[PDB]
Amino acid sequence: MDISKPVGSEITSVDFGILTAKEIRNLSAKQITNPTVLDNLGHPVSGGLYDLALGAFLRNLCSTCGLDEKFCPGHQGHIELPVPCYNPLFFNQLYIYLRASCLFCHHFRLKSVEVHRYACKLRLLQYGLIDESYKLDEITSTLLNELKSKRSEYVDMAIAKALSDGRTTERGSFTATVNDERKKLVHEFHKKLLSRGKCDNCGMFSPKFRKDGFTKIFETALNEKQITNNRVKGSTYILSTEVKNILDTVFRKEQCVLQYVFHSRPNLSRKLVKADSFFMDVLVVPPTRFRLPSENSQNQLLSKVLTTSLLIRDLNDDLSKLLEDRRVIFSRLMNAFVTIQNDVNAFIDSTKAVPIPGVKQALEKKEGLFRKHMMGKRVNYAARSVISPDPNIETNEIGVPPVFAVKLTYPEPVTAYNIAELRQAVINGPDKWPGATQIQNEDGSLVSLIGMSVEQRKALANQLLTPSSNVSTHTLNKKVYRHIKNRDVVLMNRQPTLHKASMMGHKVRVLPNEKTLRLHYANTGAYNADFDGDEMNMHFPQNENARAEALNLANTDSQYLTPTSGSPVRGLIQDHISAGVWLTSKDSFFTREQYQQYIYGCIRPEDGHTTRSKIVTLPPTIFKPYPLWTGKQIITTV
Amino acid sequence: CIVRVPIALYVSLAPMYLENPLQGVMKQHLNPLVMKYNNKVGGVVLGYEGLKILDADPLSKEDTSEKLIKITPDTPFGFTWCHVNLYVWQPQVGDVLEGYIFIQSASHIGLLIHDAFNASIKKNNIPVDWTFVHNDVELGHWVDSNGEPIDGKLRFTVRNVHTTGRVVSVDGTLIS
Amino acid sequence: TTCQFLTKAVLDNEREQLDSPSARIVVGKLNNVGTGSFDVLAKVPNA
Amino acid sequence: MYKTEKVDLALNRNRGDPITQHFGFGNDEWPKEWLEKLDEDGLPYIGTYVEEGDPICAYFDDTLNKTKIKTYHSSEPAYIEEVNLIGDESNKFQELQTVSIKYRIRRTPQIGDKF
Amino acid sequence: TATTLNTPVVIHATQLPQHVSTDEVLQFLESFIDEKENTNLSSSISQLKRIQRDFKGLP
Amino acid sequence: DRLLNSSDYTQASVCRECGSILTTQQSVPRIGSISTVCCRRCSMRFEDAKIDDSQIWEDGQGNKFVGGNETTTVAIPFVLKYLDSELSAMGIRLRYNVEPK
Amino acid sequence: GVHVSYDNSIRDADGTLVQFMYGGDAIDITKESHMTQFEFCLDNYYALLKKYNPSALIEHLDVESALKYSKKTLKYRKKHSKEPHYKQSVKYDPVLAKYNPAKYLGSVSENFQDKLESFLDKNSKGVNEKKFRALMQLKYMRSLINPGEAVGIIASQSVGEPSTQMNVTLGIPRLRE
Amino acid sequence: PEDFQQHEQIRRKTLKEKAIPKDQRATTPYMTKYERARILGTRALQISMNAPVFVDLEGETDPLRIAMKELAEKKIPLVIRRYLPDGSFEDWSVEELIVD
Ligand SMILES: [Zn+2]
Ligand SMILES: [Zn+2]
Numbered sequence A: 001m002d003i004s005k006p007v008g009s010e011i012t013s014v015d016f017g018i019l020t021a022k023e024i025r026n027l028s029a030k031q032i033t034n035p036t037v038l039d040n041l042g043h044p045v046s047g048g049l050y051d052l053a054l055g056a057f058l059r060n061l062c063s064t065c066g067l068d069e070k071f072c073p074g075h076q077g078h079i080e081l082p083v084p085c086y087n088p089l090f091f092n093q094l095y096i097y098l099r100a101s102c103l104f105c106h107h108f109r110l111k112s113v114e115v116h117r118y119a120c121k122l123r124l125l126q127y128g129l130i131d132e133s134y135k136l137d138e139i140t141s142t143l144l145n146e147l148k149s150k151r152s153e154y155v156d157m158a159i160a161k162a163l164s165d166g167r168t169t170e171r172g173s174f175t176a177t178v179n180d181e182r183k184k185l186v187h188e189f190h191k192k193l194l195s196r197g198k199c200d201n202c203g204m205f206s207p208k209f210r211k212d213g214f215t216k217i218f219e220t221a222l223n224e225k226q227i228t229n230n231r232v233k234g235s236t237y238i239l240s241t242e243v244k245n246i247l248d249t250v251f252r253k254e255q256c257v258l259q260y261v262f263h264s265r266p267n268l269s270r271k272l273v274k275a276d277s278f279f280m281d282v283l284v285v286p287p288t289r290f291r292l293p294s295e296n297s298q299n300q301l302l303s304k305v306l307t308t309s310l311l312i313r314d315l316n317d318d319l320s321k322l323l324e325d326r327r328v329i330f331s332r333l334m335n336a337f338v339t340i341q342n343d344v345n346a347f348i349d350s351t352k353a354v355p356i357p358g359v360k361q362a363l364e365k366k367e368g369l370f371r372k373h374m375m376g377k378r379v380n381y382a383a384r385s386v387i388s389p390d391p392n393i394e395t396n397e398i399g400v401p402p403v404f405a406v407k408l409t410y411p412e413p414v415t416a417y418n419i420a421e422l423r424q425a426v427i428n429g430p431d432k433w434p435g436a437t438q439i440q441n442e443d444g445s446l447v448s449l450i451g452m453s454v455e456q457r458k459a460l461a462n463q464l465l466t467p468s469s470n471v472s473t474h475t476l477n478k479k480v481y482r483h484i485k486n487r488d489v490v491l492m493n494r495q496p497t498l499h500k501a502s503m504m505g506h507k508v509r510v511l512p513n514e515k516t517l518r519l520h521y522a523n524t525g526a527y528n529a530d531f532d533g534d535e536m537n538m539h540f541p542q543n544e545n546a547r548a549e550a551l552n553l554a555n556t557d558s559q560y561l562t563p564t565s566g567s568p569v570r571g572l573i574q575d576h577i578s579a580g581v582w583l584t585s586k587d588s589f590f591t592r593e594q595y596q597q598y599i600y601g602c603i604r605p606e607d608g609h610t611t612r613s614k615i616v617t618l619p620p621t622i623f624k625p626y627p628l629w630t631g632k633q634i635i636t637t638v
Numbered sequence B: 001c002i003v004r005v006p007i008a009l010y011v012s013l014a015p016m017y018l019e020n021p022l023q024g025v026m027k028q029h030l031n032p033l034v035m036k037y038n039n040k041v042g043g044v045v046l047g048y049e050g051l052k053i054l055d056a057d058p059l060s061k062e063d064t065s066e067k068l069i070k071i072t073p074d075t076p077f078g079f080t081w082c083h084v085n086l087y088v089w090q091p092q093v094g095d096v097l098e099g100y101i102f103i104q105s106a107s108h109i110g111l112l113i114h115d116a117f118n119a120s121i122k123k124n125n126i127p128v129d130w131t132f133v134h135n136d137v138e139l140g141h142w143v144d145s146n147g148e149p150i151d152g153k154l155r156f157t158v159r160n161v162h163t164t165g166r167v168v169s170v171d172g173t174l175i176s
Numbered sequence C: 001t002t003c004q005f006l007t008k009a010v011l012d013n014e015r016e017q018l019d020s021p022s023a024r025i026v027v028g029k030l031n032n033v034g035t036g037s038f039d040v041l042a043k044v045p046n047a
Numbered sequence D: 001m002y003k004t005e006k007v008d009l010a011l012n013r014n015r016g017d018p019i020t021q022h023f024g025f026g027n028d029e030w031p032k033e034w035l036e037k038l039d040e041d042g043l044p045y046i047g048t049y050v051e052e053g054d055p056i057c058a059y060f061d062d063t064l065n066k067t068k069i070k071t072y073h074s075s076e077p078a079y080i081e082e083v084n085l086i087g088d089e090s091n092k093f094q095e096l097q098t099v100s101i102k103y104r105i106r107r108t109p110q111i112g113d114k115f
Numbered sequence E: 001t002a003t004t005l006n007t008p009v010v011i012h013a014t015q016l017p018q019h020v021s022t023d024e025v026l027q028f029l030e031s032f033i034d035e036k037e038n039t040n041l042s043s044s045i046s047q048l049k050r051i052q053r054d055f056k057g058l059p
Numbered sequence F: 001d002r003l004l005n006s007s008d009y010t011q012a013s014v015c016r017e018c019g020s021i022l023t024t025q026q027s028v029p030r031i032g033s034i035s036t037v038c039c040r041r042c043s044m045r046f047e048d049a050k051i052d053d054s055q056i057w058e059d060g061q062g063n064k065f066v067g068g069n070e071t072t073t074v075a076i077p078f079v080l081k082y083l084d085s086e087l088s089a090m091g092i093r094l095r096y097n098v099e100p101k
Numbered sequence G: 001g002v003h004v005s006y007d008n009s010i011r012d013a014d015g016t017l018v019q020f021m022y023g024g025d026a027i028d029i030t031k032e033s034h035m036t037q038f039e040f041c042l043d044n045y046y047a048l049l050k051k052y053n054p055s056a057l058i059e060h061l062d063v064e065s066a067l068k069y070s071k072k073t074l075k076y077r078k079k080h081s082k083e084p085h086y087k088q089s090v091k092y093d094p095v096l097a098k099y100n101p102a103k104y105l106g107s108v109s110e111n112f113q114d115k116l117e118s119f120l121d122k123n124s125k126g127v128n129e130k131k132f133r134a135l136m137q138l139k140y141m142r143s144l145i146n147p148g149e150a151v152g153i154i155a156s157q158s159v160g161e162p163s164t165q166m167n168v169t170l171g172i173p174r175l176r177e
Numbered sequence H: 001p002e003d004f005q006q007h008e009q010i011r012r013k014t015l016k017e018k019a020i021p022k023d024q025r026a027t028t029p030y031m032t033k034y035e036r037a038r039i040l041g042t043r044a045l046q047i048s049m050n051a052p053v054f055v056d057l058e059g060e061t062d063p064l065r066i067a068m069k070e071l072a073e074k075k076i077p078l079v080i081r082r083y084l085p086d087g088s089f090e091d092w093s094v095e096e097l098i099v100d
């Protein structure tokens, strides 16, 4: 992040949705069709997974935006599936709505006056009307047209009453406790929807379905005991085009109910919810940037989709050519319906179809994506080394070696006050402390100082503070990536960081010789850090916002009292406690020379410790035969 | 056909213009915008009048000198909404423009509109009866329907507006 | 169980206001606790 | 500390295909910068000081006509102590493809060392 | 070019435009020129004075 | 600073009516033109749109079509852009709506 | 996301409310170790008055109003407490749940109001009896927890980290259940 | 022109509805430990980016030590917008707030 390159727009909200098939045809760059990735001569095949329309690839320009590898953002493509297949993210809920629906009127089998009740209770819960949904149950062929009026009139009455009495915006109120009553009510809805015998509108049965797991679907044999209601009314692997040819007609008759089942927030967009939303007629391939070879496993899963996709296209050529051939071509085409289903199952979910890791298993657990790369990240401008104990350091500081002080760097924008100490720093160069490793120019340029001699490097010290040559950059200034000085700030951090005082903000103080981090003894009570080869992380913040927090807020002097009990966790440990039993003895007497040497050896006014600009002393305890100072009187004047 | 648009613009503001904030909106976002083409305005922005920063806190009067600017959390640049009245010269099709002759060639008629803006009239827009005389010395002229060389104004109608390059261009026919 | 909560989010068409610190590191906002619990507004002198 | 790594020019081939990679220098324009490390047989000198970036063997490649090298992939400077010629047993006596190189590293007792 | 330091983030239109005559344009171009004269736009002041002379008199 | 500014900070470009990170892209300009940032999802083909010469842009394919210019650059982590690519393969659309519209 | 709000009312990140005040008094654990050490502070009255400087804080705060309600409840509670807690029509909120303690001086917790007036009753010692109670009521107010504190992390880092040193169940399986 | 005109007057009517006036604000009058560090941090980003400084520089080259010097004489021109969990806010300038 550069503090001189801002950003105008910020994300306010996100909302989860489903790609329809019209979008990802208009969204796409170029549809790809053959299940080969790259042919001979090293160049990828056009029409395959690695394609120059999906992004730049291995010193070859993008066929969509015309940018090289360092600047092409990557582009998504789509592959066509000949049959609408199931989405394994939604088969657990598709089979709920695949069941619980009569196959004749294409309503649900539960009665339409009570399906109207859940559509009125879940409308009130979209708004902040958790109370009035229980008052709705108190509202109780001709009277059902008026009962469905009285319930719907009360819902419309209670919304406009609450929306005018400053209580709930038309965006709806959605707290935690209305998410409780909503999930409880939809579980109540889906429970007694499935447990139905006959449709209460057209009073007859419907053949029950069987879930084989994933990848398949089966209907069962309708019993001879209850086929008689199917005559006085006036097993088979069914297709995935036969499932959609019901659930389209189901989700049209009952739009007013699933408009509020599938929406937590009130639907101001008025998008109709569809049964195509549960299938996926068109896969989306990720861009070629996100599936570069290690080939890659997502190119292997998409290969078997496209390998099946040409078999099932060639199997449909014989269906245009046509009885013995018609029998065998269709019991083998239907074998290809399960396999192209089983591929897009194994593409998304490797556990619902040893195996190739799918798209879901790049997200789920630890060593995944949310916990391995979003909540926790590898960081820049950071360091790690073994700590060794160190007195003589002022208890809010860290001792950084020269091997750390040369690599780690900080962007100082040049001003009137910098150009005395930051001109000298840019003369010293990358391999001298305190130095500088780069200069970031006004126009976002970057001039590395490593391969420069002392004459060119002193020349850029005078180009450093110049008025800008451009109107478009007339308000910016150059940033010198200087070395870390003794005024910078550092986050020291020892694992396991079990409490917040195990990650503190220290000042810095370089050491000129030795190659290890050095920590004062009053910090080992907080980090749980004995010095038996333990190492700990050092983080160097890169802007003035984070410098002002690891000095004032996450400072190590702020963290004297732990918040567990309120007790102090900072103090001296082994030799200082034994020395103070000897120094504060009654036997300890010090002469005039030994007294004044112990006081200056710990105060040192030139390092900003005393408050008087002159070390004041006490009269001695004993005056004659010769003056002596007791050790109680050392710590008094200290 | 100079028209007036009142706009609203969400701009940045650097800390060197924290003592003179109306100056900083002019020198960063408005003075690089005069004599250019802007898409959401409609045509070529000539100038502006009446720059007023919309204050952050709405409890302040319009008479107040001090106003609040919402600083970016990351960077020290501040953001604000402003109202200003741009004046913009916009060409549209079917309109008649006064021209000044700059190029007399056998391919196009490159002329200037209001001494600043380029324009052209193509060969296929020029009809059959308007022939061209050659100049072996130095650039001739198109002999009109009545036999006289053209000079001064040339009132044509707009065919298409071409703002894609550096400057605006106006395509035009020579019929009624 | 990321995709069990992902499908319960997308079937509910769930919009979130990015309030939790977990959702302000996924999308990169400033955290609403401590230092991001307020805005800083500069007083500029002229109109 | 005595570290040993085996440089083998035969772990990309099988079944009698000819040795495309020979030890030593060929006849192209290879840079004479590294005569300070390597001998005329491609193999480094005994006792020389090697840090990160120095070549430890020189070999000529036949499909590229380019005497490439192999560099010392360790950030701790060493000294080449012994260089062996592992000859492979065959009836048709093969030119060498296997050389083991041994280093030594001065572990002077630094701070942080555990006694 | 093309940075938030140069362009506004989002540019809008508050109200519909209505056309003005030469008296409004010349009074603007004797105030916008005056308060800017009394920098890349120093070459753009000349291109405004090329328009200022075409609505008053003759070049 | 640790979780965004010094790991994978990026000022990616976002559409304001799609709210999608990995859609919009640099247009291939003409000779002397400028490469603007422009959206693929909420655009329309030029064979489909029966225009004002400035809303019209072109791919590198040779496909020139007129559409979404409502776009802006928003500072995100880069790992969010990979989260969208792993979810849009499943068929999950993430609409990142931005505040100045 | 659980944090102290600006109502001194700790709540979740999405706005839903956990406690109406942090622990019942909203004082910081790292600012309360000497808050009831009353005899330490009487020995250091002229030193603590320099670090709070009460004369430079009268112009912004309401010194007098919360001390009127501080006696309407103290005299009420001593007159009661002869009965147990199912009978008590308490007639009054405590002085802390009605006035904001960060702004109103004297709006303290009931244990601090009792332990001050029990300390200041027993022993009797240039600082008098009423210059000292007007300093503990200001030491209390600076000991208020700051709005914005990440409480739910701190409360849950103060239970997991003491579990590192670890006829009924006991220990880390008891915290497990 | 008509849509953005309605979009803007709604957006400025809520932000006035969320505004709490100056004599009706009831949060703390102390600048907290969280407000203090960001005032020092955001001002020091401005001083490093050539903002006009309201204090005599006694050879201070650290921008965070200059902002700690502007905070002593109460010269920092910033305003804290203390948000309430309703979405409403209160505007406190740094000069009104007292430290420690
Ligand atoms: Zn591309
Ligand atoms: Zn039925």
Ligand SMILES: [Zn+2]
Pocket: F015, F016, F017, F018, F039, F040, F041, F042, F043, F068
């Ligand atoms: Zn779009």
